[PDB]
Design a protein around this motif. Structure first.
Motif, PDB file in Angstrom:
ATOM      1  N   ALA A   1      -1.722  -1.047  -3.063  1.00 22.03           N
ATOM      2  CA  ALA A   1      -1.694  -0.505  -1.712  1.00 22.03           C
ATOM      3  C   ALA A   1      -2.858   0.440  -1.453  1.00 22.03           C
ATOM      4  O   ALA A   1      -3.355   0.508  -0.325  1.00 22.03           O
ATOM      5  N   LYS A   2      -3.306   1.168  -2.477  1.00 21.62           N
ATOM      6  CA  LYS A   2      -4.462   2.043  -2.320  1.00 21.62           C
ATOM      7  C   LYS A   2      -5.715   1.277  -1.919  1.00 21.62           C
ATOM      8  O   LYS A   2      -6.601   1.857  -1.283  1.00 21.62           O
TER       9      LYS A   2
ATOM     10  N   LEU B   1      -9.944   0.531   2.196  1.00 22.86           N
ATOM     11  CA  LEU B   1     -10.613  -0.343   3.155  1.00 22.86           C
ATOM     12  C   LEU B   1     -10.671   0.296   4.537  1.00 22.86           C
ATOM     13  O   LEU B   1     -11.731   0.301   5.174  1.00 22.86           O
ATOM     14  N   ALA B   2      -9.549   0.840   5.009  1.00 24.82           N
ATOM     15  CA  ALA B   2      -9.536   1.513   6.302  1.00 24.82           C
ATOM     16  C   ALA B   2     -10.514   2.680   6.335  1.00 24.82           C
ATOM     17  O   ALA B   2     -11.200   2.883   7.344  1.00 24.82           O
TER      18      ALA B   2
ATOM     19  N   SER C   1      -7.743  -4.149  12.329  1.00 23.92           N
ATOM     20  CA  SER C   1      -7.768  -5.548  11.915  1.00 23.92           C
ATOM     21  C   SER C   1      -8.216  -5.730  10.470  1.00 23.92           C
ATOM     22  O   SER C   1      -7.955  -6.783   9.880  1.00 23.92           O
ATOM     23  N   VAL C   2      -8.886  -4.734   9.883  1.00 23.99           N
ATOM     24  CA  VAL C   2      -9.362  -4.879   8.509  1.00 23.99           C
ATOM     25  C   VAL C   2      -8.197  -4.849   7.528  1.00 23.99           C
ATOM     26  O   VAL C   2      -8.242  -5.507   6.480  1.00 23.99           O
ATOM     27  N   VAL C   3      -7.130  -4.119   7.857  1.00 24.53           N
ATOM     28  CA  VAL C   3      -5.928  -4.128   7.028  1.00 24.53           C
ATOM     29  C   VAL C   3      -5.092  -5.377   7.291  1.00 24.53           C
ATOM     30  O   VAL C   3      -4.591  -6.007   6.351  1.00 24.53           O
TER      31      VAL C   3
ATOM     32  N   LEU D   1     -15.427  -8.726   8.383  1.00 24.03           N
ATOM     33  CA  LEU D   1     -15.319  -9.904   7.530  1.00 24.03           C
ATOM     34  C   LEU D   1     -15.905  -9.674   6.145  1.00 24.03           C
ATOM     35  O   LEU D   1     -15.305 -10.103   5.156  1.00 24.03           O
ATOM     36  N   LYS D   2     -17.060  -9.015   6.051  1.00 25.06           N
ATOM     37  CA  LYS D   2     -17.665  -8.771   4.746  1.00 25.06           C
ATOM     38  C   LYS D   2     -16.831  -7.809   3.913  1.00 25.06           C
ATOM     39  O   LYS D   2     -16.635  -8.028   2.713  1.00 25.06           O
ATOM     40  N   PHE D   3     -16.331  -6.735   4.531  1.00 29.81           N
ATOM     41  CA  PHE D   3     -15.534  -5.760   3.794  1.00 29.81           C
ATOM     42  C   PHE D   3     -14.186  -6.326   3.371  1.00 29.81           C
ATOM     43  O   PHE D   3     -13.773  -6.128   2.222  1.00 29.81           O
TER      44      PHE D   3
END
Lengths: 526, 535, 537
Positions: free
Chosen positions: C70-71, C76-77, C90-92, C512-514
């Motif tokens: 979860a970390k 990422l955020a 949207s990244v999550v 998208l890359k991340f």
């Protein structure tokens, strides 16, 4: 003991209809605490605090501040009362009641398959028409007329428990505000927060209360040989001490000769003399400072026939300067004639219940004042002090915004009808929650007649009917009789600024609280 | 996850799921094989003529020292579901054949041990189990190729005595290496039914009494019971016994139902006193009229009967148990008579000298029958200097009796000493490469497992297993395969034909078949659901 | 037998299943707050502090997670906020779905290395596809793309007003802080914009100040509170009675000199405080303090002297007003200087009453004309969320100005990419077509989530969207259907170019890359060992 693999140990989640209706129910619960503190027939609330004190009041904000809630949604309604206390004066009870109704009508529509953003959007649009309507029904104020201003104040102290002495309180508030109308640089200000001191002394009766043309401090003279009565003093205000102190350094003076010990001590005495010679060059009568005065300094002051006050608080010394016209200096060596408080009036040290109070009054043109309250005990004195705070705020308000709205429920009914007449042409899904706002507005005349024991059908049916005509638009509730009287004869007028903020707060409060769908509890911060 | 869902709610499938354990993978298979190693390491220590004994301490504090694998494995406190099955393997061998209580555990363990590499090679667990069947058939088919016997069970019992010596040689009774071998042969052949090749286990009783020495163990052509003559002055010797077997107490007959005799007059009271006296006299004379001179009664005697038994010179014993009167009647050719009035000479038993034996300072008064007429039952009387050697002697003779019964059931034998096992391992290896499609590794593993027996025998014999196995396996190939085995003292050469090491064909056939089936049912498992703590 | 590790070890499908759950438990938090039809959350800590928000960044920063899988999503955020500044929802959502689909591939015996390889190919092509389907730069749209971009970013926030009140304040505040650096870098450092809060009037009465708002007070009640045509003196030293350093001691054998030595401690201070005022300065700003003697000289001089302000704000005022900050004396062993000619300017410096509190404003500054925004809310909960909402809106407009390219919103980007990649998966479909197709399918979680939160039929509304995007790719007749998105208020497709629904290009390419890198990393944690803490021994 192998634990269960979890995330966010010892936390809770609540989501869905349990929150959408939960948070509204919390607002409904807290809203009732002060339901009976709106109209002129209010009852007193006795609040007990954990310290052992007692608060007797009907002020909506003072009551709510003393209530500790657990629900995180109810805390939001407490914050609303905190905002109103500083923005407006008597915009209190009516805001919590109306804000609760804005959520009540939301619950009805939210359970009818309507998205929260449709309910919120409809209320945001309604605000624009409620604010626009209020500005169209106002009346200008000629604030220079003594009687108009006293009547405005009378309408704001009627609800409070000191209305019995309205012929005294109205004059206290009106003059106290005028004495703190400042204009020195290019800015007009009314300061009722820093210099509008209220000084309450137990004893006597409330009819003895007055406003002093100047200030008072609870201090005695440093020495009995100094004058206690000076008709026209030359007042000098100091910030520095008249004592000799070791400096903040590592000074080391070697005593080596027979005379060295006594020579050092002689110089310490000469220091005090240097100060004494500089503070008398202006021929003062009265010297008031904040810091200690040495015994040697008093020797010279007595010879100069100067009256001295020892340890006056910073908040009192700045107020003295405004009343007597003196300048406060922190360097006695740079005293000049321009610092002397000319135009000051009588200095007299009086005794009230074997306690000394120094009065500096009868000033030519003071810019600060003290309101002197007397009474049986702290019970009535606390009630009067708080109520005068509201009266001076309402006086200040109209002095800066000279517009009144016909009050006593007349405003809320006129706006509710204006909303209805426009709603006829919405022709969309928002037509219905828009009209719901107009219904919520009627809670104010409803609660005014409920607290008086009157019928909720006979008065509101007739009152609504009267507001179908375009002639009067000023029909409201007579809180003393229980009937309907044109406000043009009752004389109940309320500041426009309070009415504009009342609607703005009620709508924006709902905007925040109707968006919460998920309550997360149990986390800690680092 | 259990007890936690993606929505934060508890997730409960089965009761008390947090106290369960599941691990499948290859770990269930390795755990089963590893646990079996702990079992095999135990039994390998008691294989061969030098096999070492175990001391078993029971839950109540009782202690017995034994060699018999049936007595070792049956007293285990192992809480493992597969290790318990290893005990059942030894039980099935004990029930069907009665010999290989050590062998089937050592063999089955070797199959599990050798299988370990096969799993690590990536061979499907089930393909391993099936591969053992293809190799096992080869060993079994060749096992029946080399076999011969000259035993006829009439008089030429030399190879039968030799079989008993081979079995007893592993036990703690070699001080009676010959004596007990002869007792076992005589015990079975005098009761065995040559017509059907059946031997009734109930026709050989085994008794014992602490004291003396193993060399005093005798075979008695008759029955031994606890003798207790009801009259203490009754003569203790009968030269020619005419035996009445009776299952009725020596007291006036009573009805079985509720009776409640009504007595009213004095004539009724006194008349009954006379009638009852007559009943005591009649019940004794009814025995003498048949010519009987010894009565054996399941029930006790009245005081009145003991006097009449004396005056009529009619010895008798009391409270002889159910199976004792059953065996006596059969051994003596008689019948059990219900009542006194049904006595007849035709139902009397015939026997010779009847005597009781007193042992040292004790009062055991054990029966001996000297002569009998065509008896079909025998009794073995075991002596010994302590309780442990006697109880072990009971098992030692039991094994000797069992292998005799097995030869009667099937008279085909093989050569022992490892000769059969090494020959089978060589035969499987020769066919293991015909054809190496998928099972080449599995069939070779089977052949290697078969050698666990001569290797463990070599270790317990004090020899290096590499120096011993490489020589014997070479000698069995360079020349036409002789019955070449191993031994500790070598006895000259290791020719099993000259050492007379004889084992039963049907014994080894069962050891291979039962061991193979047990391995299969514990390989084909990949999930164990055993509960943990109660709470 | 077992490992002698004193902790707890899980292998195989145990961890491969747990990481999917842990990742889902995080995506489940923010999925409900996507789009204008989402709803806000209230976060309450153990002691009673209440935070209102709906952004993925604040929520995941405040909420504690324990599982190591979860970390990854929480980090990422945090990266999205650093690299882009917005779009952090949207990244999550997308990253979690990439794992969910990968789990299905792994349980079908698709080697993890072939799943990872296929995912990277799909990402690289997606970057190419979106860069070939851009709408326009910011030259043809002019100010319209800036007002639209501002209102788009506000559509999910508390300041999501129907009007242009806030959109005008944001766009003009960013354009008003244009600082061009060497080699043609017309930067808009929105981090220099001071955002103020106050619980007062409604939202539509917030102020946009031309100049700078300094959270300070005049202090001593004898100084002027309004100065017109002010000279500003910025300094950073203490206006206090002179103190000695510990290394110097005063040792007196002749007491006659004591009074002179003591007097010196005030003579230096009183002279310097006046010589900085002989320069003509009207407003004196210091981050230190002004003692009781020094206040007299500022008051009697008619000067405004502000004390105990933050160094971070004085540096911004000095740059905006053209002043040099004075720290000490100079001119190569000069007596006393005070850099008299280096004063700044402002048209007006005034203290105003802002919700019964004091705030000093510096108007127009006459050198750089900086900007400051003072927000009004009804209560503290709104004020904190409004500040967060304004910061986001300022960042989006900055990015649009710096990166002169817009893409359609409303899910149009994800719908178009979900079709282009399917054709790639077929054309190169040898052994990795399963991983490429699953990457493409995961993209649809965005128009799907938006439909669900809007209470629409997800399976019909989104399916129709794809029909329009497919037609313009398989029938090359210039259909121009590639910029169509979802209208969540009507349940119908909309042309995002005519509807004014624009988003930056970078918020899609970088996301998208991340997400790809994070999605790959989480797939290589087959085993987990956790050691017992040194607590119980």
């Amino acid at each position: 003991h192998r634990p269960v693999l979890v995330l966010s140990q010892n936390t809770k989640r609540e989501s869905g209809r349990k929150v959408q209706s939960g948070n509204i129910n919390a607002a409904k619960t807290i809203a009732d605490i002060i339901r009976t503190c709106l109209g002129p027939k209010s009852m007193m609330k006795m609040l007990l605090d954990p310290m052992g004190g007692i608060v007797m009041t009907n002020d909506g904000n003072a009551i709510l501040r003393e209530i500790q809630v657990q629900h995180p949604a109810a805390k939001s309604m407490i914050e609303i009362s905190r905002t109103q206390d500083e923005e407006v004066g008597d915009g209190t009870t009516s805001v919590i009641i109306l804000a609760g109704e804005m959520l009540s009508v939301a619950e009805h529509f939210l359970e009818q398959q309507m998205h929260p953003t449709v309910v919120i959007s409809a209320y945001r649009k309604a605000l624009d028409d409620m604010i626009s309507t209020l500005k169209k029904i106002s009346i200008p104020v000629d604030i220079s007329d003594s009687d108009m201003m006293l009547n405005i104040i009378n309408s704001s102290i009627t609800t409070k428990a000191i209305s019995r002495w309205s012929s005294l309180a109205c004059n206290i508030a009106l003059d106290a505000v005028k004495m703190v109308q400042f204009e020195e640089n290019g800015r007009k200000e009314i300061d009722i927060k820093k210099y509008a001191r209220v000084e309450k002394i137990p004893g006597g009766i409330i009819e003895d209360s007055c406003v002093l043309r100047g200030v008072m401090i609870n201090k005695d003279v440093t020495h009995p040989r100094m004058r206690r009565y000076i008709k026209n003093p030359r007042i000098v205000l100091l910030d520095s001490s008249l004592e000799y102190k070791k400096g903040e350094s590592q000074t080391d003076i070697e005593i080596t000769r027979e005379e060295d010990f006594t020579r050092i001590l002689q110089m310490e005495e000469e220091y005090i003399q240097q100060l004494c010679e500089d503070i008398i060059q202006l021929k003062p009568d009265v010297v008031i400072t904040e810091k200690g005065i040495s015994d040697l300094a008093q020797h010279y002051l007595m010879r100069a026939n100067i009256t001295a006050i020892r340890r006056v608080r910073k908040t009192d010394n700045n107020r003295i300067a405004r009343a007597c016209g003196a300048r406060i200096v922190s360097r006695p060596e740079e005293l000049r004639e321009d610092d002397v408080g000319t135009g000051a009036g009588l200095l007299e040290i009086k005794k009230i219940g074997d306690e000394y109070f120094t009065f500096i009054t009868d000033c030519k043109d003071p810019k600060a004042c003290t309101i002197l309250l007397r009474g049986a005990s702290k019970e009535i004195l606390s009630e009067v002090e708080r109520n005068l705070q509201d009266a001076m705020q309402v006086c200040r308000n109209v002095l800066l915004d000279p517009q009144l709205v016909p009050g006593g429920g007349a405003s809320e009914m006129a706006v509710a009808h204006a909303l209805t007449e426009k709603s006829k042409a919405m022709t969309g899904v928002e037509q219905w929650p828009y009209r719901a706002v107009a219904q919520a507005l009627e809670v104010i005349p409803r609660t005014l007649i409920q607290n008086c024991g009157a019928s909720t059908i006979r008065l509101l049916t007739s009152l609504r009917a009267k507001h179908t005509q375009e002639n009067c638009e000023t029909w409201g509730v007579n809180g003393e009789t229980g009937t309907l009287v044109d406000m043009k004869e009752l004389g109940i007028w309320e500041p426009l600024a309070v009415k504009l903020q009342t609607y703005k707060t009620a709508v924006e409060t709902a905007v925040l609280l109707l968006r919460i769908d998920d309550i997360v509890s149990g986390h800690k911060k680092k | 996850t259990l007890a936690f869902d993606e929505y934060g709610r508890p997730f409960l499938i089965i009761k008390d799921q947090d106290r369960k354990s599941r691990l499948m993978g290859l770990e269930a298979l390795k755990s089963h094989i590893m646990a079996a190693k702990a079992v095999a390491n135990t039994m390998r220590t008691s294989l061969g003529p030098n096999g070492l004994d175990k001391m078993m301490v029971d839950k109540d504090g009782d202690v017995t020292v034994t060699n018999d694998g049936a007595t070792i494995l049956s007293m285990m406190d192992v809480d493992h579901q597969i290790a318990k099955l290893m005990v059942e393997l030894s039980k099935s061998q004990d029930d069907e054949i009665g010999d290989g209580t050590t062998g089937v555990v050592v063999l089955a363990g070797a199959l599990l041990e050798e299988a370990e590499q096969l799993l690590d090679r990536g061979i499907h667990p089930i393909r391993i189990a099936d591969g053992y069947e293809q190799a096992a058939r080869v060993a079994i088919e060749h096992l029946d190729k080399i076999s011969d016997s000259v035993l006829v069970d009439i008089k030429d019992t030399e190879p039968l005595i030799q079989t008993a010596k081979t079995t007893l040689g592993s036990k703690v009774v070699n001080s009676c290496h010959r004596q007990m071998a002869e007792i076992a042969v005589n015990a079975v052949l005098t009761v065995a039914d040559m017509e059907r090749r059946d031997v009734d286990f109930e026709l050989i009783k085994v008794e014992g009494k602490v004291g003396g020495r193993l060399e005093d163990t005798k075979l008695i052509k008759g029955v031994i019971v606890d003798k207790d003559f009801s009259h203490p002055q009754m003569p203790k010797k009968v030269e020619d016994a005419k035996i009445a077997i009776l299952t009725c107490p020596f007291e006036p007959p009573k009805p079985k139902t509720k009776h409640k005799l009504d007595v009213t007059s004095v004539e009724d009271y006194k008349a009954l006193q006379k009638y009852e006296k007559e009943k005591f006299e009649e019940m004794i004379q009814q025995i003498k009229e048949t010519g009987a001179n010894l009565a054996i009664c399941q029930w006790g005697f009245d005081d009145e009967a003991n006097h009449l038994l004396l005056q009529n010179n009619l010895p008798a014993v009391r409270w002889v148990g159910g199976p004792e009167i059953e065996l006596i009647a059969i051994a003596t050719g008689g019948r059990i008579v219900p009542r006194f009035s049904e006595l007849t000479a035709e139902k009397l038993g015939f026997a010779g000298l009847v005597q009781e034996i007193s042992f040292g300072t004790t009062k055991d008064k054990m029966l001996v029958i000297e002569q009998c007429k065509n008896s079909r039952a025998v009794t073995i009387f075991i002596r010994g200097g302590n309780k442990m050697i006697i109880e072990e002697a009971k098992r030692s003779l039991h094994d000797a009796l069992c292998v005799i019964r097995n030869l009667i059931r099937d008279n085909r034998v093989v050569y022992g000493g490892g000769a059969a096992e090494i020959s089978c391992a060589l035969a499987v290896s020769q066919e293991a490469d015909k054809c190496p499609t998928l099972e080449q590794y599995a069939m070779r593993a089977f052949a290697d497992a078969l050698e666990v027996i001569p290797m463990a025998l070599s270790e317990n014999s004090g020899m290096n297993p590499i120096q011993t196995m490489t020589e014997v396996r070479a000698r069995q190939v360079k020349e036409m395969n002789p019955a070449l085995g191993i031994d500790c003292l070598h006895k000259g050469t290791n020719d099993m034909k000259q050492q007379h090491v004889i084992e039963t064909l049907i014994g080894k056939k069962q050891q291979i078949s039962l061991a193979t089936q047990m391995v299969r049912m514990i390989l084909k498992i990949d999930d164990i659901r055993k509960p943990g703590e109660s709470e | 037998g077992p490992l002698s590790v004193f902790g707890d070890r899980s292998t195989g499908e145990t961890i491969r299943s747990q990481n999917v759950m842990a990742a889902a438990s995080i995506a489940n938090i923010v999925k409900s707050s996507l789009g204008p039809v989402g709803l806000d959350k209230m976060l309450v800590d153990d002691i009673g502090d209440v935070t209102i928000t709906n952004d993925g960044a604040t929520i995941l920063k405040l909420l504690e997670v324990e599982h190591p899988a979860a970390k990854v999503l929480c980090e990422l955020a945090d990266l999205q906020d650093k690299e882009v500044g917005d779009g952090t929802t949207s990244v999550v959502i997308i990253a979690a779905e990439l794992l969910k689909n990968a789990d299905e591939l792994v349980k079908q015996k698709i080697h993890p290395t072939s799943v990872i390889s296929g995912y990277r190919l799909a990402c690289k092509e997606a970057v190419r596809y979106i860069n070939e389907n851009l709408i326009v730069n910011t030259d043809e749209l002019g100010r319209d793309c800036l007002i639209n971009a501002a209102k788009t970013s506000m559509s999910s926030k508390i300041i999501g007003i129907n009007g242009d009140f806030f959109a005008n304040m944001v766009v003009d505040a960013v354009l008003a802080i244009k600082y061009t650096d060497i080699r043609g870098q017309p930067r808009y450092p929105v981090n220099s914009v001071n955002i103020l809060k106050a619980h007062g009037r409604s939202q539509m009465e917030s102020m946009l100040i031309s100049g700078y708002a300094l959270n300070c007070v005049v202090g001593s009640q004898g100084m002027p509170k309004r100065i017109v045509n002010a000279k500003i003196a910025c300094l950073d030293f203490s206006l206090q009675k002179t103190k000695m350093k510990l290394g110097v001691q005063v040792v007196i054998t002749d007491p006659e000199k004591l009074d002179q030595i003591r007097q010196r401690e005030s003579d230096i201070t009183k002279e310097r405080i006046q010589k900085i005022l002989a320069t003509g300065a009207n407003v004196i700003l210091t981050t230190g303090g002004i003692d009781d003697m020094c206040l007299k000289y500022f008051v009697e001089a008619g000067a405004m002297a502000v004390r105990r302000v933050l160094k971070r704000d004085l540096k911004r005022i000095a740059k905006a007003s053209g002043a040099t900050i004075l720290s000490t004396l100079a001119n190569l062993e000069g007596e006393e200087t005070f850099e008299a000619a280096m004063l700044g300017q402002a048209e007006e410096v005034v203290q105003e009453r802002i919700c019964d509190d004091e705030l000093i404003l510096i108007k127009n500054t006459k050198a750089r004309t900086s900007a400051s925004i003072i927000l009004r809310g009804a209560n503290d909960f709104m004020c904190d969320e409004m500040e967060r909402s304004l910061h986001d809106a300022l960042c989006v407009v900055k990015r649009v100005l710096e990166s002169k390219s817009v893409v359609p919103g409303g899910g149009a980007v994800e719908a178009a990419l979900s079709i282009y990649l399917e054709n790639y998966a077929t054309s190169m479909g040898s052994r990795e077509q399963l991983a490429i197709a699953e990457f493409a399918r995961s993209l649809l979680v965005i128009p799907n989530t938006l439909a669900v939160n809007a209470a629409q039929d997800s399976t019909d509304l989104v399916a129709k969207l794809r029909a329009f995007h497919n037609e313009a790719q398989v029938n090359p007749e210039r259909k121009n259907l590639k910029w169509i998105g979802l209208d969540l208020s009507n349940g119908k497709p909309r042309d995002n170019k005519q509807a004014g629904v624009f988003e930056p290009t970078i918020v899609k390419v970088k996301s998208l890359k991340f997400a790809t890198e994070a999605a790959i990393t989480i797939l290589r944690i087959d085993d987990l060992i956790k050691l017992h803490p040194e607590s119980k021994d």
